[PDB]
Target: cupin 2 conserved barrel domain protein
Amino acid sequence: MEIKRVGSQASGKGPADWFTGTVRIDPLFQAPDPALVAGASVTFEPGARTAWHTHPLGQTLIVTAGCGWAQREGGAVEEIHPGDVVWFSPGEKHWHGAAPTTAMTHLAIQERLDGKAVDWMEHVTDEQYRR
Amino acid sequence: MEIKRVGSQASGKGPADWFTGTVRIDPLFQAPDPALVAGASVTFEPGARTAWHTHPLGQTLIVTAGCGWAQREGGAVEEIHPGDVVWFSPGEKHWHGAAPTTAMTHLAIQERLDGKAVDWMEHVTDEQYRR
Amino acid sequence: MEIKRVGSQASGKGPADWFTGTVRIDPLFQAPDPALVAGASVTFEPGARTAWHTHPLGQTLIVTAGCGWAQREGGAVEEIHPGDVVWFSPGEKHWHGAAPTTAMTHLAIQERLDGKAVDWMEHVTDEQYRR
Amino acid sequence: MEIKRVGSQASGKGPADWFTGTVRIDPLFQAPDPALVAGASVTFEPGARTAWHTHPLGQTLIVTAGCGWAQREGGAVEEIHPGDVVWFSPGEKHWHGAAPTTAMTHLAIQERLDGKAVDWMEHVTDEQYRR
Ligand SMILES: [Mn+2]
Ligand SMILES: [Mn+2]
Ligand SMILES: [Mn+2]
Ligand SMILES: [Mn+2]
Model:
């Protein structure tokens, strides 16, 4: 047993290849072998969102604050709220972020395959970023 | 892409075989193959706690509300707070719960191994629940 | 500067005359004079709710967990979600609590008028609760 | 009567005269007369904090995420953690904000006295922010 106390895991920023706009990532856990699962709290500023991407064993999102958008490829752009729970299937191309006027914060949970829990792709355009 | 909207998953109660005291279990997500991760929000009334148990692939707690206790065997009873992230190793024997006078809620995340994500053991006695 | 610290204030049961069902009250603050504002976190088990009541200077609810219901007399029963802000106008007879199968938690903020912040009335019947 | 659903109030940025660093203000509520209370959710990025200021009827903080620092003048700087409640007296000169490397979110609740909730004084210097 070990405890990572509050404020002991520093906030980091979203790298510009992977996110449009201002995103802060607050690491929560990365579970050692034989566990595969990792999680972090991600906070998007108004207008911010991830580039298109996929997850090898999928990801679950648990919204914890604010109001944001999310779309799987060829689906519609959905609105998500605190308490909402999202599932993206393995390989499903998708994106998620804040709404244009409000921040959003979510817990993102995903299992790694190699040492690889995400595949990044093209950014989400302004044209694509609408509802 | 699937969304479980807030309020669409019924609250449930912890069965007396697995818990001392009153415990509410709010499921959040589970599975499906090939992914293995499951999660729930677990709320303990003051004085309530899990029985001793283990997890075949480990467990992460993210404390979301109140103030609880937790102890691995051989360890001291720790006090945990919101924003604390707690990890128990695969096979590690332990219990978690509320403190005597305050409720505690946490996000419990674990991976399943051939069907189960917990092995239940004896109750935590009143003498053991002391710190 | 006074800080209380999480875990430091003990939880309480909502008295039977003011609540139907199982309610937990986690006190937060009570400002001294000349300020008038008080706040508590209130947690309603499924199907639990306040009696009908009024607040002499209105009340603001900030839902923090779960899914609840609320109504003023002659109005529709509405769902309240985490992140929602609910305002009850001064003297308006109302009730608020859990949805019938999901718990919920809210921050209740109200100002006291002559050393009182609520007036308690009859319980909300099972019919009024649904209808 | 009224319910402001989550993503319906646009996030705002803290003005440069009142904050050091990047700060987001999410408005929550302002009670109309004869009530005097108002509330916002304020999110400080790592290193960001308010200027020195006072409140005419005092202020209540309820930390909701992350990890932050606070100091009334003549006092030590204190850590505040999620679920902590902080009280500042009317007229008490003080500041609050993020820790140097972790962001922080809190609920700020204060009452207005003839239409003002705060009086703004000088910025907090890098030297005062240490200790
Ligand atoms: Mn994703
Ligand atoms: Mn466990
Ligand atoms: Mn009320
Ligand atoms: Mn202040």
